[PDB]
Amino acid sequence: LLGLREFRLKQDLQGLNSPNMYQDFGHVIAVDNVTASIDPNSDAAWLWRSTPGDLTKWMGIPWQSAAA
Amino acid sequence: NLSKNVSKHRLAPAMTAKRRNPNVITNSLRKQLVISSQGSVSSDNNTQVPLRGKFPANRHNVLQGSIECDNEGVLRFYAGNGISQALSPSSLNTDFADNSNWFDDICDGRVTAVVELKNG
Amino acid sequence: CQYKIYPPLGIARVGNGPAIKPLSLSTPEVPWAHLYDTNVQYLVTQQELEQLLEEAFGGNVINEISQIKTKLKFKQEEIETITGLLGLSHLVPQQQLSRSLDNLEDIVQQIKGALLKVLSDHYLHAVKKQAQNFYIYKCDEQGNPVEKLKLTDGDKVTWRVEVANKKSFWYDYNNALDLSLHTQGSGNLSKNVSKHRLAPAMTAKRRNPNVITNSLRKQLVISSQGSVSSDNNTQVPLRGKFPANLQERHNVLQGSIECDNEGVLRFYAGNGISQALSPSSLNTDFADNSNWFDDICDGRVTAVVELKNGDTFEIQDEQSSAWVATTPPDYAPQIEPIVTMYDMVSGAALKEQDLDNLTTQFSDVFPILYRLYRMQWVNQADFTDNAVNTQIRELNSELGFAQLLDNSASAKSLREGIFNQFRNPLFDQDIDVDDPSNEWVSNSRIIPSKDETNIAAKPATSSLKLPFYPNDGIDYPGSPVQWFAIPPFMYQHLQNWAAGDFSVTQVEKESANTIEELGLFYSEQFKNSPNSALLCARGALDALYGGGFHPGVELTWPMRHNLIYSQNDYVSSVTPEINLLGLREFRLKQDLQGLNSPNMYQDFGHVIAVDNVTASIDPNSDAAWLWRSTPGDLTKWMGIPWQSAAASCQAVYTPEDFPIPSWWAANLPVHVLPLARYNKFKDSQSADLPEINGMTHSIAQGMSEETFEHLRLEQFSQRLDWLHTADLGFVGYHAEGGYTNGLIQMVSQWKNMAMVMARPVENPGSSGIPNVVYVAYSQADK
Amino acid sequence: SCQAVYTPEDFPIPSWWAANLPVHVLPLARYNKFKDSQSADLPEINGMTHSIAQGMSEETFEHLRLEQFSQRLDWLHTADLGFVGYHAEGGYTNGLIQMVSQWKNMAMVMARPVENPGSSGIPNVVYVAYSQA
Amino acid sequence: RHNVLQGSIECDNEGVLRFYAGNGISQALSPSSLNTDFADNSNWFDDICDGRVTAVVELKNG
Ligand SMILES: [Mg+2]
C-alpha cells in the first residue's frame, strides 16, 4: 500500500531567532540560486534548512486568490 | 518525483521572480513584512493559547493559530480563521499568486517539547 | 578593399507623408547641422501640396481640358484621360480621384480645388518620412574613403536591400539581458551592474506562444527585398505579408527604395501602420502584444558597381556592406538625446579598466551640457527643476560661459560643482549596503512600483543626481540603476573636466561667451570637416537614443556591445584640434546569406535568458548567431507594435511632485511648448497686426511695456503634456484617460502627436524669451 | 469627477468647480522658487545657491521668478490618485477610487506673501497650494 | 467608408420573391471601439435591416 516511511524536515535549531530567518537572494530569485543551494556549504544552502514561514512562503498571497 | 528530461531538454524553463511588495527596501524594513508568533502549553493546564502576530510586524492583528494541551500530553494545533486582508481597501488581489499590500493568516513553523518526569 | 557603402547603419523613420523627395526629410549626414533652423517643416504643409498640384498641370493639361470644356458633368474615359495626365495615382488611389471629379458640374479650378481637397485630406499635416540616403565611396590602399563614386557614361550601380521584421516571432522584452552578463566592464556599462546584481536580467517567454514548432513560427516573420539601379529611378516597394507565406493575410509595406542617376540610394520606411489580426486584440502592454504586427523592419544593404570597361565590384562583405533599420518618428529632430546611439558605438570599443588612459577635451564634455540644456524644450524638469541648466543660464546672462572652459585651479570649484551633480555610472554612490549576499540599496529617491505597500517609505538621505530619467533597472525599487547615468566613458570625460585634466583651444574660448555661441561654433566645425563618409556614419546615429534601454526607442542593448560590430575603430578628431567625441569607422556583423541564412529563424526555445547571451559571446559557439545579424535582428527586440512602447515612453511619476522623471523626451517629448502659446508670445508690442499675442491691437498696446513682456513669459512658460496633444482616450465627458488607453489609441494617434520645430521670435525685447524657440505643432493646436 | 473635461481642442481647458475643487494650482515648490529677491542673504535663494542667484543679471533673476510662478500643477496630481509608480494606470476611475483616502492629502490653497516682487510681474499676494508639506 | 450588404433578392420564373439577409458582419469605424454594452455601442454598425416590399403585376393583355 505504498509503504510507511520515517521522514523529518531539515530544521534550523534557532527557529525564529535564526540569523537566516530573513535571508533572500536580492532583487530576483532564479534557478541559479537553487543550483547554488544544493551545495551544503554554500551561502545559499539555508534555503533547505527551514525556519518558521519557509514552507508556506512560496504560496499565493492571499491563498484565496490562488484557490479561485 | 521528477524526470531529468524536464531540465535536460528545457521542457518548462524556470522563470526569474521579482520580490513581492517591492517598494519596501532594505532587509531591515522588509522584516516588517514577516508575521510571526509563538507560544507554549503544558500538561498541567489545558487553557488554549493563541498564536497572534502583527502585520506590519514590529496595524492589524493576525491570528495564525491556537494551541491546546490536554492532561495526557497530546498537543492540538488549530490554524487561523481564514482572514486575508489588504492594508488598504482599494488594494485588490487580481493576481493568482502575487498581490502586494496583502497578508493572510497562513503559517508554518517549528514544534518542540520537553518531557519532565517526576523522578527529575 | 575598393568601394564601400555609407552609412554603415542607416536609419529611416516611419511617417504617413508620401515617399517622394519634396515632401520627405533626410536622415542627418552632418551632426548639428540644423539645430537653430527656424524654417524646418517636419509636417506636410499646405504650400507643399499646392506646389505639388501646380507641378502636375500642363503638361498640356490646361488645354487638354479646355478642349472638352467646348465638347460639352463628365464621363469616365473623359476623366480617366484627365487623371493619368496628373501623375497623382501614386499618391492617392485612382478611384478616389475619379469620385472627386464626379461631384463636379474656371473649370481648371474646380478641378484643382477638388484635387487639392483629396491631397489635403490624405497628407496635410502628415508626419513626413525621414528617408536615408546611402552612398558608395571609393576607397584606398587602406580602406579609407576618399570621395563618392562618380558615375561616367556606361557606369552602373545596382543596390540590393533585404529587410525583415521578427518582433512577432521573438521574445518578450522584460528588461535588458546584458544586465546580468559577466563582464570586465565597457565604456557603456560598468561591471558593477552585473557583479553586484543591481538589476538582474529576467527570463522572457515567446511572443505569440500559441504558434508552436519552428516551421509554423516562420509565418510570424515579415520580409521583403528589392533592387534598384542608376539606369532607372523608378521607386520599388518592399512589401511583405503577415502572416507570411484559408489564412487571412495582410500586406505590409516595410519600405520603398529609389536610386538616382548618380548612384545614390534613398530608402523610405513604412507608413506607420500597425494592426492586429483581429480587431478585438488590444495592445495593452508596452512591449509584448500577441496577434499584432507592425511595419518596422531592418536588414542588409549591398551593391555592385559595373564600370564601362567591364570591371565589376561586389559590395557584399561585412567590411563594406551596410545595414538599414526603421524606427518610430523623431518628434523633436533638433533636440538631441543626451546619450546617443553613436555614443554607444564609441563606448563599446572601450574597456572600463582603461578609462584612466582616456584623454579629454572640452569638446568631449560640451555635448553633455548642451544636450541637457536643450532638453528644456521637451521636458519640464529640464526647464524648471534642473540646477545645472539654471546655472548655465546664470553664466549666459553675464556672458560668462567661457569660465567652464578654464582648466585652471581658479575655476576648479566651478567645474566640480557641476560635475558633482551627475550620476556616477559605477552605480556605487548614494547607497547603503545590506550585509557588507551584499545588496546595494539606494539612499536617494527611488521610483516605486505601481504595486503599492502602505508602509512608510525610507526617507532619502542623498540628493537625486542628474539626469532625472529612468533607466534599465527601473523594475527594481531601490536599485541605483533605476535612474539613468551617462555611460562610464562619458562620465570619465566629465571627471577629467572637473579635475582640470582637459585641453581646449583659445579659439574655442573666444566663441564661448554663451552656450549658444559655442554650440554654433562647434556646429560649424562639423559642417566644414572634410570626412563626409564618417560624418554621414555618425549623423545617422547621433539623433538616436543611447539609453536607457527598456527597450528604448529605435534600437536596444545589443548595440552597446562590441560583439555586434565586425569593425569599430577610432580614426580621427572632427577637426585637427577639436575632437567633439570623434569620428569612427564601424560596421555591423552581418550574415552574408541574408534572408537565406539557415539562422534566419533561430531561437532559444521556450524562454530566452542571459545564459543564452553568455553562450553567444564565443564566436565559434552555436549561439554566436545572435550577434551575426540577419534581416530583422536589430528591431525584433523592440515593442510590438512600436506605438504602444512609445505611449509608454513618457513620464514615470514619483510620490514627490518634482522633478517629473521622463524616459526619452528628446525623441518622444513629454512636456512641450504648443503652437497656441507661441502665438501668444511671438509678437512685440509694436507689431502691425490687428491681433497681437492673442490680444486685440488696442489691448496689447494699452498695457505697460513691462506687463506686456510679463504676459509673453507666462505664455512661454505654459508647457503641455505631449500625451495631450492628440486624443489618447482622455477627451470627452467621463473619458477614462489613463496609461492603457494611451497605448491603445497611439496606434492611430501617433500621426497626430505634436511635432517640435524651431521657430523665430523676432523681437523678444526684455521678455527673456530666446530668439529661437522650439514649438510643438499638432491639430489639437491652437 | 469635479475637475477638467477635455475637448478635442487643447485650450481653454474646461473645469467644473475650480474655486472649491481646484484644477490647476501654484504649488509650494514653485512658491519657494520665486518668493525671494536677489538681495536675500540666504545660502539658497529661490532654489539656487547664493552664488548662482547673485551671479546672474537682475533681468534673468526676475525672469526665472516669473517662469516658476507660471508653473501650474494639475490638482489631481497633488497626491497619489493612482498615477504614481512604474506602469501606474492613472486615469479617471482610479482617481475616484483613491480620493476616498487621498482627499485629506490634496493640495490646499492659501494666500501667501511675496515681500519684494521687484519688476518680476508677480503680485504681492499669491495663492499657493500646500500638499503633504 | 464601409460597404454593408443588407440583403439579396431573387425572383424565379413563377414570380416568387426570395429575400436573403446579410452575412452577419458587424464592425466599428475604429478597431479600438469595443462593444461593451448589451445594446448601445457608439461607432458601430451592423448589417441588420428592415423595410418595404411592393410589386407590380403586368398581364399580357396590358
Ligand atoms: Mg529628438
Ligand SMILES: [Mg+2]
Ligand atoms: Mg473656494
